[PDB]
């Protein structure tokens, strides 16, 4: 309505400027135009301000909406991990050590020693191979282990007949030996 007052005051002044009219009434017309223009500049400045604030409101709402979407997406990933790891624990071997303890409480480092079904040995040279893994079964951690596989540093499979003092320069050390609890 301030724009409509400004526009109609412009035409009311301009029709008098066209013919020249009289300054007596031209000053009164100019004052009406400048008063209406000043109120129009107040409304137009506030409208332009509110149009700038409308983007700030909507972009802050999109930031909140994406922050709840990402909190929901990571929460089910942490649950999916924890409720997957829980399936790998063989409760028959784990309950036997936890029931034997004074307080139902144990060190963490003895769980893989006393409960793990599978061992990996990483070996840097043939002298260390002869000391730790010679043959097809070996003893470690007060238990007996049987070799299921050997691989080299390229993840190629190595056969137990290839590992000798004569052939050792040809292999890609370290070897990784994988064994099952007997």
């Amino acid at each position: 309505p301030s724009y409509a007052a400004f526009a109609t005051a412009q035409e009311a002044y301009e029709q008098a400027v066209a013919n020249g009219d009289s300054e007596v009434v031209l000053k009164k017309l100019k004052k009406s135009l400048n008063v209406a223009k000043s109120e129009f500049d107040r409304d137009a400045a506030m409208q332009r301000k509110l149009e700038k604030m409308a983007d700030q409101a909507m972009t802050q709402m999109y930031k909140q909406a994406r922050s709840e979407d990402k909190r929901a997406k990571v929460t089910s990933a942490m649950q999916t991990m924890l409720f997957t790891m829980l399936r790998k624990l063989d409760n028959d071997a784990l309950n036997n050590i936890i029931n034997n303890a004074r307080d139902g409480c144990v060190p963490l480092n003895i769980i893989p020693l006393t409960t793990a079904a599978k061992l990996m040995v990483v070996i840097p040279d043939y002298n260390t191979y002869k000391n730790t893994c010679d043959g097809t079964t070996f003893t470690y951690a007060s238990a007996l282990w049987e070799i299921q596989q050997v691989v080299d540093a390229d993840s190629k499979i190595v056969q137990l007949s290839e590992i000798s003092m004569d052939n050792s320069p040809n292999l890609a050390w370290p070897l990784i030996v994988t064994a099952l609890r007997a």
């Binding site: 080299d152 540093a153 390229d154 890609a172």
Partner: protein, 73 residues
């Protein structure tokens, strides 16, 4: 300037071997890394030019990896 040009050529030559997937052989990459790291620490050009002949012989042994008759133009 030949000592600086040999050290700069060694940086480009191992960068060509890395792009030909030589990292996919643990036994061979560990020799190329030792030849490269020695050429950069060298102070006699006669040591650096011997280690450069061994390092370039890796690239020339990879038959069909580079079109050498097109790179020599």
């Amino acid at each position: 300037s030949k000592m600086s040009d040999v050290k700069c050529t060694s940086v480009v030559l191992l960068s060509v071997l890395q792009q030909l997937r030589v990292e996919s052989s643990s036994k061979l990459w560990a020799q190329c890394v030792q030849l490269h790291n020695d050429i950069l620490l060298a102070k006699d050009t006669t040591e650096a030019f011997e280690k450069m002949v061994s390092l370039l012989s890796v690239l020339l042994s990879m038959q069909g990896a580079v079109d050498i008759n097109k790179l020599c133009e």
